[PDB]
Amino acid sequence: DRVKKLINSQISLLIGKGLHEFDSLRDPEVNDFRTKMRQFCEEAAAHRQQLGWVEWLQYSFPLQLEPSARGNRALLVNVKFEGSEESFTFQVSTKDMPLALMACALRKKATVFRQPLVEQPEEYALQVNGRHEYLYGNYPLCHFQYICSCLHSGLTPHLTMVHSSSILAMRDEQSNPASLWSLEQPFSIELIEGRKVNADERMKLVVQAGLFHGNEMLCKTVSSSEVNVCSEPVWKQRLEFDISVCDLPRMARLCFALYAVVDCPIAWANLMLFDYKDQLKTGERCLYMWPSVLLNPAGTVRGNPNTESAAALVIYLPEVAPHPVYFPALEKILELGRHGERRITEEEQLQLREILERGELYEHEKDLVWKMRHEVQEHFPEALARLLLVTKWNKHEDVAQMLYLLCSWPELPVLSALELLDFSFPDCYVGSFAIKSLRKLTDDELFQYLLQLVQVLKYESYLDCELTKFLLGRALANRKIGHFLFWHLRSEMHVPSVALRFGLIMEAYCRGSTHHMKVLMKQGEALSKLKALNDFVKVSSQKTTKPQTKEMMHMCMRQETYMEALSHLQSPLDPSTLLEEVCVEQCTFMDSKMKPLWIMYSSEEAGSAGNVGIIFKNGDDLRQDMLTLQMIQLMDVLWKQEGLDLRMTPYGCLPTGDRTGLIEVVLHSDTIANIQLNKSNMAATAAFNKDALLNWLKSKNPGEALDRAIEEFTLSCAGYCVATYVLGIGDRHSDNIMIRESGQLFHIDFGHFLGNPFILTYDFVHVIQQGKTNNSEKFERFRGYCERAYTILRRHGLLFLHLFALMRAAGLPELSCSKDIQYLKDSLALGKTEEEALKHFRVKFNEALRESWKTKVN
Numbered sequence: 001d002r003v004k005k006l007i008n009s010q011i012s013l014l015i016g017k018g019l020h021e022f023d024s025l026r027d028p029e030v031n032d033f034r035t036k037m038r039q040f041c042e043e044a045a046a047h048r049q050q051l052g053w054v055e056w057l058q059y060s061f062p063l064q065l066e067p068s069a070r071g072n073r074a075l076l077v078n079v080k081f082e083g084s085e086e087s088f089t090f091q092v093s094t095k096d097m098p099l100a101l102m103a104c105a106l107r108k109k110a111t112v113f114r115q116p117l118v119e120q121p122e123e124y125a126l127q128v129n130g131r132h133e134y135l136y137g138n139y140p141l142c143h144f145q146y147i148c149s150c151l152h153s154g155l156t157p158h159l160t161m162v163h164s165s166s167i168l169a170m171r172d173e174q175s176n177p178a179s180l181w182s183l184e185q186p187f188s189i190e191l192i193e194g195r196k197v198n199a200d201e202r203m204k205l206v207v208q209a210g211l212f213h214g215n216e217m218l219c220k221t222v223s224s225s226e227v228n229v230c231s232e233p234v235w236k237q238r239l240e241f242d243i244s245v246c247d248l249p250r251m252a253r254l255c256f257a258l259y260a261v262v263d264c265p266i267a268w269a270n271l272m273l274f275d276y277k278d279q280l281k282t283g284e285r286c287l288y289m290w291p292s293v294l295l296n297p298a299g300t301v302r303g304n305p306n307t308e309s310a311a312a313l314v315i316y317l318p319e320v321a322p323h324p325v326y327f328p329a330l331e332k333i334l335e336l337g338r339h340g341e342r343r344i345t346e347e348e349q350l351q352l353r354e355i356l357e358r359g360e361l362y363e364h365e366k367d368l369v370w371k372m373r374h375e376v377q378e379h380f381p382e383a384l385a386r387l388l389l390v391t392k393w394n395k396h397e398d399v400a401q402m403l404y405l406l407c408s409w410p411e412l413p414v415l416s417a418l419e420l421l422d423f424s425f426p427d428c429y430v431g432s433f434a435i436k437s438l439r440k441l442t443d444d445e446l447f448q449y450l451l452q453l454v455q456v457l458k459y460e461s462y463l464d465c466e467l468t469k470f471l472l473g474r475a476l477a478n479r480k481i482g483h484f485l486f487w488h489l490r491s492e493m494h495v496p497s498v499a500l501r502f503g504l505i506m507e508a509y510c511r512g513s514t515h516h517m518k519v520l521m522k523q524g525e526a527l528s529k530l531k532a533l534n535d536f537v538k539v540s541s542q543k544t545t546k547p548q549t550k551e552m553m554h555m556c557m558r559q560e561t562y563m564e565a566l567s568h569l570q571s572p573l574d575p576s577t578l579l580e581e582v583c584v585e586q587c588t589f590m591d592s593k594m595k596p597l598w599i600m601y602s603s604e605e606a607g608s609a610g611n612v613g614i615i616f617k618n619g620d621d622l623r624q625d626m627l628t629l630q631m632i633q634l635m636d637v638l639w640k641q642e643g644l645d646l647r648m649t650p651y652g653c654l655p656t657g658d659r660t661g662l663i664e665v666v667l668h669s670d671t672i673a674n675i676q677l678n679k680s681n682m683a684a685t686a687a688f689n690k691d692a693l694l695n696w697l698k699s700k701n702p703g704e705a706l707d708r709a710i711e712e713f714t715l716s717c718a719g720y721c722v723a724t725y726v727l728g729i730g731d732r733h734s735d736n737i738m739i740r741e742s743g744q745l746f747h748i749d750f751g752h753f754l755g756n757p758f759i760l761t762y763d764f765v766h767v768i769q770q771g772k773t774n775n776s777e778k779f780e781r782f783r784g785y786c787e788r789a790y791t792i793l794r795r796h797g798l799l800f801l802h803l804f805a806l807m808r809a810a811g812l813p814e815l816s817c818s819k820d821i822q823y824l825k826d827s828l829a830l831g832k833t834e835e836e837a838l839k840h841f842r843v844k845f846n847e848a849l850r851e852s853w854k855t856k857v858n
């Protein structure tokens with residue numbers, strides 16, 4: 001068909017890789033993934049096209065509820081009907097439900113239009129004006145993020161009554177167009193030769209090889225003989241490992257590291273010993289090596305695609321049987337593991353309960369955990385991860401006994417399942433068990449952990465896996481999940497080790513949602529133009545003055561192709577945000593090294609809410625910033641769930657390509673540095689520089705509004721002081737700290753975290769203290785907020801630990817080792833009691849106060 005060919009070229013363009021490149025590999029694993037996932041995704045699309053209209057609102061506009069609502073007060077609301085300039089302003093309560101508000105608008109419609117209407121409130125949903133956001137369901141208005149936000153900002157909610165027939169037309173418009181255990185011999189390989197090797201001719205070449213199950217060795221590593229440096233080294237030697245073929249676990253990976261010795265690391269290469277169809281591999285393998293920056297078990301098990309430049313290692317996997325050998329089926333494993341013995345002292349049960357509730361163990365402690373594995377399943381099922389780490393993955397009988405217990409193991413909480421996704425648990429049955437326990441994740445929880453789940457994909461041994469199918473199914477059932485899954489994958493297509501896997505997932509996704517593919521192409525077309533616009537700005541800035549470059553940026557944006565590409569798109573930062581008309585006159589660029597673009601938009605339909613900005617940045621890697629901001633947002637969720645609103649500003653930050661991304665503009669905000677410039681002929685010009693922030697807050701908040709802004713400042717300062725301490729955010733100064741006109745303080749530009757002490761600044765203490773030198777009442781109230789926020793985070797310490805552990809897959813320079821995670825373990829003081837950790841925090845807080853006073857003395 002002409003339409004299939006067009007769809008194929010549109011996917012190719014969108015994902016940044018031609019679909020022809022998949023077919024060219026002539027790889028059956030690739031082929032099977034493509035066919036199986038295309039079928040799975042098209043079935044999701046057909047189920048979606050028949051959804052009921054409210055179910056379709058749930059798919060396309062999932063509810064944005066307050067964290068406190070998850071699991072009184074007077075309010076004015078403006079309500080219009082779709083395709084009508086006319087609106088109605090009425091007084092409702094924060095405790096009222098959307099239905100009462102809709103019944104109220106329909107009664108008004110009936111009186112104004114003089115008709116006794118047939119119209120029932122059950123046939124409508126409320127759209128947030130000029131946003132892809134809807135208010136529906138049995139929730140009081142205050143439970144909706146949009147209404148809650150309006151209440152605190154003092155703004156009036158603007159809502160549109162949309163009929164079921166209009167929602168159904170949206171659904172329709174958006175349719176897809178019409179035996180191993182017998183093999184006792186030791187595992188061995190033949191190391192044949194190397195190709196395209198570059199090293200000092202005075203040195204020698206050695207290949208180190210190890211067998212791994214995740215991070216753990218299956219046996220001691222074996223090294224080759226030292227052979228003279230040359231571009232084509234020849235070994236033709238047998239390397240024998242101390243493990244029987246029968247004992248190779250299903251997820252066994254053979255890892256190689258080529259290096260030069262007089263140590264000069266050259267390259268590395270890994271492979272699974274069983275293929276995707278569970279067949280033990282035999283015959284020759286040409287392994288295109290990755291350059292080393294010595295064994296790398298966590299590294300990808302797929303060869304370097306740069307076959308022209310990559311060093312190659314040629315090996316031979318011997319034919320261990322006259323017929324193909326497959327890893328035993330679950331039925332055979334369960335049959336073998338079924339048999340075992342079960343019987344300890346009451347005093348020993350106390351030692352077991354002690355260690356299973358305690359996390360490194362001594363050999364005798366591991367032996368008691370393994371002996372007592374049945375009691376682990378029956379009375380401590382949440383200690384599965386500990387049992388799994390003591391299992392001898394290099395003994396096929398122990399693995400069968402572990403797997404037998406795993407198959408009757410009760411489902412575990414979401415938190416436990418997050419830990420099981422760690423690279424430390426490489427077994428496919430454990431991986432499948434972790435996903436089974438993660439299926440109960442709500443869309444809000446999934447959204448919060450999506451970044452980490454995408455990183456887990458880089459640890460996967462095969463293309464078709466339970467995690468990919470889970471992520472695809474959830475993405476096809478929730479458009480906002482689909483949106484962020486697409487962007488997390490797309491932003492890494494320039495990385496050769498993930499481009500194949502990520503490309504295949506986005507293709508499969510596009511098969512499941514042809515309409516969303518076009519919505520995403522429109523976003524990619526805007527980003528392409530921003531990149532070209534930024535390129536022009538960067539060059540024009542190096543030659544002429546800012547007013548000239550700004551007028552030329554504006555002239556370029558005014559071109560028909562720019563006006564069209566940059567307008568009428570869903571924001572990549574938030575698909576609920578519509579970026580309607582680009583406001584060229586208000587667009588500019590920043591003076592920092594990369595000259596980031598400052599893009600403003602307006603929307604008549606949304607009114608003041610359609611006034612939104614985006615920052616486009618090309619040249620810096622935005623992944624660490626996004627992680628930092630998502631961890632700050634998680635803190636805000638956890639605080640809100642305990643009734644603590646610290647008035648944080650978790651603005652959007654999204655990498656979209658190679659050193660490319662967007663940052664959400666927080667309007668009505670300025671840097672501490674700009675405020676402290678203490679410029680003349682301004683409202684905030686102070687007698688003392690310490691008065692500058694308070695005078696700025698007083699100018700934006702006259703009379704009675706001042707008290708609320710100081711409170712907003714105090715709460716957010718407490719939230720950011722705790723956030724930066726726990727996350728080890730350093731390099732903090734007046735140009736990367738901002739303040740909203742509301743009084744809310746927030747941080748920007750998180751280039752450094754995890755320590756790569758607690759901080760209190762005098763200018764800020766002055767605001768908290770309402771401009772008084774001595775105000776211990778206000779200061780200690782601020783200290784109370786800090787301690788409460790800190791104690792709440794500590795209680796969820798394991799969630800942060802598990803999420804950061806998954807993030808080690810990302811390849812962030814400040815999150816490479818366990819030493820980086822030590823900062824988190826220490827900042828949260830998880831080894832201590834709540835009393836001891838609070839004692840430690842008070843010492844670090846009191847220290848920051850004495851450090852702050854070295855500025856108060858002046």
Ligand SMILES: Oc1cccc(-c2cccc(C3CCOCC3)n2)c1
Pocket residue numbers: 590615625651653663664665666667669748749750
């Ligand atoms: O998270 C980052 C990373 C790098 C730069 C920035 C950055 C640079 C200028 C301005 C802003 C603010 C964003 C929120 O709205 C006000 C501007 N962020 C933020």
